[PDB]
Structure formats: C-alpha cells, structure tokens
Amino acid sequence: PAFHPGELNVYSAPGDVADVSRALRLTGRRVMLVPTMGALHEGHLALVRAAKRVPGSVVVVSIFVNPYPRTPDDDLAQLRAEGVEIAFTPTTAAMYPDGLRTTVQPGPLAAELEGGPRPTHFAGVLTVVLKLLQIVRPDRVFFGEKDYQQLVLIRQLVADFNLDVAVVGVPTVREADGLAMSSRNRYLDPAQRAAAVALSAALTAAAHAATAGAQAALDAARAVLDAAPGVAVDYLELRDIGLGPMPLNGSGRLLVAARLGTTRLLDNIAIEIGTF
Amino acid sequence: MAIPAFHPGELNVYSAPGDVADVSRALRLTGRRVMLVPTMGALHEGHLALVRAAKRVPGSVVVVSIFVNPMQTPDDDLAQLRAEGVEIAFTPTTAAMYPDGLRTTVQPGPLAAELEGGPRPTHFAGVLTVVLKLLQIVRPDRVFFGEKDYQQLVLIRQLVADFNLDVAVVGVPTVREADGLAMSSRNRYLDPAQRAAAVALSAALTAAAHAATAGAQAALDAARAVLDAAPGVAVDYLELRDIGLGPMPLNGSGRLLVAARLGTTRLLDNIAIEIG
Ligand SMILES: COc1ccc2c(c1)cc(C(=O)NS(=O)(=O)c1ccc(C(F)(F)F)cc1)n2CC(=O)O
Ligand SMILES: COc1ccc2c(c1)cc(C(=O)NS(=O)(=O)c1ccc(C(F)(F)F)cc1)n2CC(=O)O
Ligand SMILES: COc1ccc2c(c1)cc(C(=O)NS(=O)(=O)c1ccc(C(F)(F)F)cc1)n2CC(=O)O
C-alpha cells in the first residue's frame, strides 16, 4: 500500500493498515492508536494531540462502529487539520467476515454498572478493541477517562492477554460549564442541556465535600442531582480506582449515570477521602 | 531496559514472561524468525516432531514453552530440548501467567460446544486463553501444533483469524507408534488388552480413508466395522466433517474424527479423507 508522509492516508482493509503500521514501526516510528466511533469532537482532538506529542510518533485514528451519529466528512477534515497521517476506516465485512465467533469474555467488572442491564455490551467492546490492537499493533493506545469503566476493562484486557501496548487515559475535555464532552450531547433539547450541567456540578461538589468523608461526598452529589429538573439518576457510586473488588480507601473514583429524557449521560471524577 | 542474558547456540531457560518477551523481541530485530512450540512438558516424540519442523525454517530460533494450565521428566525435558538444539525454553509459574487470577478470558465460537466440547464444555476456553497469552508473550512468526487434537487445532485457527493475530499456525501430522496408535501421554496407562484394542481407532480411520473411493457411506461403514471388531472400545463419536469441521461437502476434502473410552482412558484420533 502507498504511504504519503505528512498527508492523511485513509485505509479500509485491515491488511493495508497492518502492513503500513509494521513498516513504519520497523523504520523506528512509534505507532499511536486513537480508536473512535467517529463523530469526532474536541475530546478526540485532545487524544490525537496527546498522541502527536509522543516523539517520532505516527498517529492512527480508527473510525468504526460495531454492530447512532455517523458524520465522516466532518471526521476526516478534522484529522487532516491536526496533521494525522493515518485514518483506519474498515467495513463491517472486513472486521467480521465470519460473523461473531471467537470473542472476549470480560471479567465480572463487565456485569456491574453499565454492564448490569447490558450483559454482552463489554464483551463486544473488548473484542473490537483487541482486534484493532492486533491489526494496528500500536505502542500506545489512547482513551478519554469519561467512559471510565470501559477504560478499566481495557487495562484488564491488556494485562490479562499480555498485550504489548501502553494504555493512556486522558482527562475528559469539558464544555465551558463542566459538561463532559460527548457525541450524545447533541441529543439534548435546550432545557435538558441546561440541566445536564448537574452531573459535573454534583461530582465536583462531591470532590470538595469529601474532606468531610465519603458519606458527605455522596450526599452532596445526590443533592445537586435531586435539585436538577428532569434528571433521573441510574447510579451514583463511589469505588476503588480499579472499580472493585477492593473496598475504597482514601482515593477513589465517583461515577454517575443519568437519563435526561431518552439520553443517558455518564460522568466521573477522582475523589480523595479526608482530602488527601 | 537492558535485554536479559541470551547465549546463541545453547539452551536458555526463562520463567519470567517479561524476560522471554524481551529476548524474543531482541531476536526478531536481529533477523531470526521466532518459532513457538507450546507443550505441557513430559516431552515425547510427538513434541520432537513439532521441534524438528520448527528448526527447519531458515534462521529459526525455537521457543518451547512448558506450562501446565490448571484452567486448560523435567531437567529431563530440558535435556531433551538441549539434545535437539532448542535455544529457548519458557517455563513460567502459574502465578506468572495468572498474576491477577482468572479474569479476562477467550470465549470460543460454537465449535467448542461440539465433539470434545460435549464431555468437556469449557475445556477449549481454557486452551484458547492460554494459547492467546503465549502468543502475545512470545510473539512468534509461526506456531506449531500436532494434528492429533484436530478440533483444538481448528479452534486455534479460528482464534488467530478472529482476533487478527499475525502468526502462522502450522499443523504437524500426528506421530504414531509402530502399529498406528496416535502418540498420547495416556497410552502408557493402557494394560496390554486395552493397548491391543486401541489400535482399532487408527485402523478404522485408515480403512475409511482407503474405502473413500467408494464414497462417504462406504468410508464410515468401514471405520465402524473396524471399531465393532474390538472389545472394550466405547465409541463416543465417529464423524466425517469438512476440514474446518463444518459439515462434510458433497465431494471434496474432509476429516474423519473418532473418540472412544477404553476402561478409564479416553482416546482420540482423526484423519484426512478425500471423497471419491
Ligand atoms: C479526552 O476527552 C474526551 C471526552 C469524552 C470522550 C473522549 C475524550 C472520547 C470519547 C469517546 O467515547 N470516543 S468514542 O465513542 O468514539 C469511543 C468509543 C468506544 C471506544 C472503545 F473503547 F471501544 F474503543 C473508543 C472511542 N468520549 C466520550 C463520548 O464521546 O461520549
Ligand atoms: C446475563 O444475562 C444474559 C442474557 C443474554 C446473554 C448473556 C447473558 C450472555 C450472552 C452471551 O454470552 N451471548 S454469547 O453469544 O456469548 C455473546 C458473546 C459475545 C458477544 C459480543 F458482544 F462479543 F458480541 C455477543 C454474544 N447472552 C446472549 C446469548 O446467550 O445468546
Ligand atoms: C506431532 O505429533 C503429535 C502427537 C501427539 C501429540 C502432539 C504431537 C502433541 C501433543 C500434546 O498434547 N502436547 S501437550 O499436551 O503437552 C499440549 C497441550 C496443549 C497445547 C495447547 F494447544 F494448549 F497449546 C499444546 C500442547 N500430543 C498428544 C499428547 O501428548 O497427549
């Protein structure tokens, strides 16, 4: 396959990107992977920028939706402007020629929180991520921290399968009021958008409240969520940073998921208890 | 950062996954092609054939792993490897392989529920997980298995296809005793009557293969007849399938697989079949 350095090369076939990726690595370049479902926003640009600041790196951004917002004219233009040299955009047929066959079965974390009502959801995420990792074989792969449980499951996948890639979590880029960036924010009417600030407001309230201990942190977050119109909370949980089965100590992660109309929003934050 | 000690032309034993990973990387960067022979130790002639097939690749360095998977002849095994010119034995502990215990695993496609998956329903999940791990630690160019456990071999090829692994899977024809009995650690348990009756499995299969000019029913009936002539041979299945273990086509290449119990020992064998 042709590679044009300092231009955006778009590859469809896993074979093409795999050969280009390996050739590059051989000539000393480090391969950075940013896996996406497209519909790119500023948080993705932050993943790319962090990937680009890795010296001698070549950046690969993949755009692929398993089997939703699909806007690839926008997606590609942004990459060219950030100076990304590789977009990997495979077909479903190329990723899944045999359909669903060999799969990743996540540990029990995958049955908690987001996984509780969606029992195969993380199996599907870990299977596609493993496949992207094997196609591309990057040195480092980048994720936003907003989908924190998913990021922890990925660290599990990488440890548990001895995968030779460094996983980089990048702090969640926010709108000016604190709203975690998300593709799905577009689905909020003006009143829902106004109210949605409560998730991030609740979590920062909790993070400062936590000097007074874990119950006070939780109750602060809960009062903010309850003060907000049309916000229905699925969960609000405080956990170890690995998300269990450890009891929380002095440091943890506070996670929330809520529905505004039909739109589910997630957010999370670091929390120190007895602030520390 | 510093590569662990490796001495070309002799036997280098590592028990730490990170060490073998580092040696193997260092080796392929200097030209060598890395060949992986996974074993559970207690080496026999079947393993020495996997080994000889590996050594014959120009520029090969040979990694034999020795690992008994609880989820699935010592200084002696190592002596055998030395006498074969094997340069790397990988001998990890259970703790090294599973430092976080059992967590993320491989879930096999539906083939794992058939045939051997009938008696042992999660056996292949355990095999595919350890094989994925060994492949990721060693990162070989080629990996060598006997054709004796044929279903296991097909499932591994599904693993490799499905997860986009960049390794070649090499199946090496089954090594057999003088009378045709497929080498197996279990053979030494058979008393003389069982041992004499056991020849029926390979006898049935070769008869079928030669009968196949007369078609599929003729092949199967010949095999059955031969099995029916043996006392104490309790056949769990005798099945003709295509080379991928889906259903046998009209006419073309196939595989005939058999499994049976003699006293307390379970024996398997299989053979290439050509219809017509
Ligand atoms: C650095 O700041 C941010 C903030 C939010 C982010 C991101 C970065 C990245 C995402 C995100 O979800 N991207 S995405 O859905 O295309 C995505 C989804 C799933 C996976 C995974 F793990 F399966 F490969 C990767 C990217 N998201 C959240 C989102 O768009 O909902
Ligand atoms: C906890 O309650 C449930 C309900 C349904 C479940 C399960 C659990 C588990 C499965 C399941 O494992 N399905 S299956 O084909 O293994 C599977 C595995 C992986 C994927 C994925 F997401 F990778 F694509 C889909 C289905 N399934 C789907 C099934 O058994 O067909
Ligand atoms: C070239 O011909 C042969 C003939 C028989 C063989 C072999 C090769 C290899 C074996 C064998 O099982 N080796 S082993 O159990 O130590 C083994 C077990 C499991 C795996 C796997 F796939 F999990 F990686 C590999 C080797 N066996 C059968 C046995 O020893 O029971």
Author numbering:
A (entry chain A): 4 to 70, 82 to 290
B (entry chain B): 1 to 72, 85 to 288
Paper text:
Based on these observations, the initial optimization strategy was focused on replacement of the methyl pyridine and the benzofuran groups rather than the acyl sulfonamide linker in both compounds 5 and 8. Compounds were designed with the objective of optimizing interactions at the P1 or P2 sites of panthothenate synthetase. Consequently, 1‐ethyl‐3‐(3‐dimethylaminopropyl)‐carbodiimide (EDCI)‐mediated coupling reactions were employed to generate a series of indole acyl sulfonamide compounds (10–19; the syntheses are described in the Supporting Information). In order to establish this, the structures of the four most potent inhibitors (10–13) bound to the enzyme were solved using protein X‐ray crystallography. The X‐ray crystal structures of 10–13 bound to pantothenate synthetase show binding at the active site, with a conserved binding mode for the indole sulfonamide fragment core. The P1 pocket binds the alkyl groups of the pantoate substrate and is primarily lipophilic, surrounded by the hydrophobic residues Pro 38, Met 40, Val 143, Leu 146 and Phe 157.
Herein, we describe the use of GE to optimize a fragment‐derived inhibitor of Mycobacterium tuberculosis pantothenate synthetase, an attractive target for developing new drugs against tuberculosis. Pantothenate synthetase catalyzes the ATP‐dependent formation of an amide bond between pantoate and β‐alanine. The work presented here demonstrates the use of GE analysis to critically and thoroughly examine the binding distribution of a lead compound and illustrates the practicality of applying GE analysis to modify parts of a molecule that are not making efficient contributions to binding. In this case, it led to the generation of a relatively potent and bactericidal inhibitor of M. tuberculosis pantothenate synthetase.
